[PDB]
């Protein structure tokens, strides 16, 4: 979408594989605000909003909290406390046309600045002066939007770049979007420090001969002590035996 009319996609109830985006070299800008770019997988949020737009090279610096300019103030404004990472890459060989690619537009003239994540898509001819335009362009009557002359012969500062901003929103909600989870090899007949989903402790795990119901994740004994767990991956039932100890 055009930067003046950015396409907001809500990401929820899914596994956010941030390691691919971080590890790859396809992006030229990767500015993370409020999160650590190498710890992003461990941060769970209620909503993730993917703001997709194209800006010019010189304006990539403007896709940040606190920036100003024709785009930052009249097209796509970010809040000072924006949380998320801004990812952008050079798209010169994708959007530019020999005769100039003018299909990408941005808003240049507006009565006031946008609110965070405000999408103003009005096409009313902007009245800059005091004379009503009444649908006629002229003195003090300027169209509020203007197109970009994207061409393959333009310098880098005028080449198109594709920018994707992943906005991280945490609401009073379960927080359904998280990164991939770590898993390790199962160790049997030895004392290990284990963590099965949310069940943690120390003990010896052996093959179980117990039969759990299809919806039961772990077993607990008469003293509220965990004595069996279901393996989250292979649906094996494992008994937890406390590590041998005693007086000497």
């Amino acid at each position, epitope marked *: 979408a055009s930067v003046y009319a950015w396409n907001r996609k809500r990401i929820s109830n899914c596994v956010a594989d941030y390691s691919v985006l971080y590890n790859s070299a396809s992006f030229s800008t990767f500015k993370c605000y409020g999160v650590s770019p190498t710890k992003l997988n461990d941060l769970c949020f209620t909503n993730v909003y993917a703001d997709s737009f194209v800006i010019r*090279g*010189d304006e990539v610096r403007q896709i940040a909290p606190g920036q*100003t*300019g*024709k785009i930052a*103030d*009249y097209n796509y404004k970010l809040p000072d406390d924006f949380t998320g990472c801004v990812i952008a890459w050079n798209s010169n060989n994708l959007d530019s046309k020999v005769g*100039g690619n*003018y299909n990408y537009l941005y808003r*240049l*003239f*507006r*009565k*006031s*600045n946008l609110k965070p994540f405000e999408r103003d898509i009005s096409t009313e001819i*902007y009245q*800059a*002066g*005091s004379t009503p335009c009444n649908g006629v362009e002229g*003195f*003090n009557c*300027y169209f509020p939007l*203007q*197109s*970009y*002359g994207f061409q393959p012969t*333009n*310098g*880098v*500062g*005028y080449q198109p770049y594709r920018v994707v901003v992943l906005s991280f929103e945490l609401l009073h909600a379960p927080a359904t979007v998280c990164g991939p989870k770590k898993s390790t090899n199962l160790v049997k007949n030895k004392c290990v420090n284990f963590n099965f989903n949310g069940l943690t402790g120390t003990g010896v795990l052996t093959e179980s001969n117990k039969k759990f119901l299809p919806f039961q994740q772990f077993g607990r004994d008469i003293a509220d002590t965990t004595d069996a767990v279901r393996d989250p991956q292979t649906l094996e039932i494992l008994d937890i035996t406390p590590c041998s100890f005693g007086g000497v």
Partner: antibody
Amino acid sequence: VQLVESGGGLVQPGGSLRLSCSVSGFTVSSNYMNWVRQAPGKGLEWVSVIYPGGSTFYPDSVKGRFTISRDDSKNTLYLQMNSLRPEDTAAYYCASSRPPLDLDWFDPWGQGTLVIVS
Amino acid sequence: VLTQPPSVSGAPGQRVTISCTGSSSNIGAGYYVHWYQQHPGTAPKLLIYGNSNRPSGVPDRFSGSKSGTSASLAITGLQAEDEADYYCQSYDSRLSGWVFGGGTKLTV
């Protein structure tokens, strides 16, 4: 449209000027505005860049000294220079309405304000 | 500041141009070369905007082309309309400055 600058002239060293940059036709409140200074034999550098939302950018020429503004009621801009450096001896320019696939950057210029700042 | 020639001299009738070499963020000054025909003693008047493009009221002389870190501000059919001071401008480094080049006082 007509942009007549006022307030330029001779002012003693070190002071501030509340000059006004009148504009006709286009009520000067909501166009991307720029103000520049250009001494004789010198070039015009953007002293300030008054974004129509309100943001002001003073890249090179002005340094914490000059304030670009507009009087909303009269549709005429005001060109504040205050705490002018001995380096501020120059003339003013305050017009930005680009057009009449394009670029449209800093097209017009008004009558200008000529100031002698010793 | 882009390197602009100090001056341009000639009598009217010979095809001429005002080349202006300046990276100005590359892109031929971002096709953002604001060429202005500043009259001597009068405030600058823009001649051509969007260097390749001719703004309203531009003379038949008006022309403009930018290559790499260089520009070619051309006036065709040298006539009385050409004798003026010329100024070119572009964003400072890579900003939205609209900074100005060396300035070309074309004097006949």
